[PDB]
Design a protein around this ligand. Structure first.
Ligand SMILES: C/C(=C(\O)C(=O)O)c1c[nH]c2ccccc12
Ligand SMILES: CC(=O)c1c[nH]c2ccccc12
Ligand SMILES: [Fe+3]
Ligand SMILES: [Fe+3]
Lengths: 119, 118
């Protein structure tokens, strides 16, 4: 009687996002989780932002990863300051901070996940 | 003065794992996190279990993903029951349950992450 979720991703609306974002962990899964996790593979998102600047009332971690280090690069706008992240990298976005990211470079298998931390 | 971690992954020992697992989120990051997240790319893990059956004191979620759906396939052993999962998939391993996974097939850029839930 294992607990398996394969109806994935779960599209959920997120502030400023053009489309609902694809979630793989949501707060209600498995009786409740302290995180939510959304994101996807970046290879076709180069130069195409998924959202306008937005703010959350919870902390958000960007997790950027690729099979080989350096194969993925995103630009994070944080309250009007630009930060370039190179895979692998984890960046904390404090709750209340205005932000978004733009994909600069991505191979097949590059991902950016946003991890919302429940407080 | 942004908070960016680039010294990654962090190899940490886990009971029953042949190697230290590669962690990308650890409990002490950023003043404390309610999860830890480890894992890695699966194309070089086909047929090579990362661990004997093992147990954690916390829940662990397997998160299986591949660039295109269906491109990665793992076998999850949970308390003597075999489960074959196809990406994308998330499976909860209750704390104390003996478990491990084996990669059957994976394209480059497929991942399995183990998420330890505080
Ligand atoms: C942390 C962890 C476990 O505890 C497990 O294998 O159950 C991993 C999940 N995916 C992995 C991929 C490579 C190395 C380790 C893991
Ligand atoms: C937080 C984050 O990275 C994302 C939020 N929405 C997305 C859609 C495609 C890929 C990544 C994302
Ligand atoms: Fe965000
Ligand atoms: Fe485990």
């Amino acid at each position: 009687d294992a607990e398996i979720v394969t109806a994935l991703p779960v599209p959920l609306a997120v502030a400023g996002h053009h489309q609902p974002a694809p979630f793989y962990l949501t707060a209600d899964m498995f009786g409740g989780l302290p995180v939510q996790l959304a994101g996807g593979e970046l290879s076709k998102l180069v130069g195409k932002p998924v959202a306008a600047p937005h703010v959350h009332e919870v902390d958000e971690l960007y997790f950027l990863v690729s099979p080989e280090p350096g194969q993925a690069r995103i630009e994070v706008h944080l309250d009007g300051v630009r930060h370039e992240l190179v895979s692998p990298a984890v960046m904390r976005i404090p709750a209340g901070s205005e932000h978004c990211f733009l994909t600069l470079e991505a191979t097949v298998g590059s991902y950016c996940f946003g991890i919302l931390v429940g407080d």
